[PDB]
């Protein structure tokens, strides 16, 4: 219930930045493409292009950059264990 003041945080994809200011441009995934601004708890550097970032649902603002899309049918071929075979 202290996680109830947390946020839904919809994730997106960034096309490019603009000059003299952040003024970031985002394709969400299906909805539309919006021009946004960053929130205050971000770093103005690691918001580069082609970067899956979590964006506010109400005010449309970028919060956290994340690892990209990994195509989860490719996630299941890392071994995650060690089969016991000795030299």
């Amino acid at each position: 219930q202290s996680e109830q003041p947390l946020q839904v945080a919809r994730c997106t994809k960034i096309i490019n930045a603009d000059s003299e200011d952040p003024k970031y441009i985002i394709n969400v995934k299906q909805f539309a493409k919006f021009v946004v601004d960053l929130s205050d708890q971000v770093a103005p550097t690691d918001i580069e292009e082609g970067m899956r970032v979590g964006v506010d649902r109400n005010k449309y603002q970028i919060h956290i950059p994340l690892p990209p899309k990994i195509d989860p049918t490719v996630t299941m071929m890392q071994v995650e264990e060690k089969p016991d075979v000795t030299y």
Binding site: I14, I15, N16, V35, G50
Partner: protein
Amino acid sequence: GDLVGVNKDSYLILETLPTEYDSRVKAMEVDERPTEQYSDIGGLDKQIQELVEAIVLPMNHKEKFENLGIQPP
């Protein structure tokens, strides 16, 4: 066919956006700038001459073509 910034509620044109470019196309840009000078390739000097005289000089001396006046390849 231009990108413009439009208000959500008013539906009124506000700004003018640069281009419609894919993120993969932006990813195709070369920014590492590798280092391999022409002395690293041995035994292919004539092909290096042909390549440089074909490409690097249209990038550098265009008037030298049009004084002779033909076409760049």
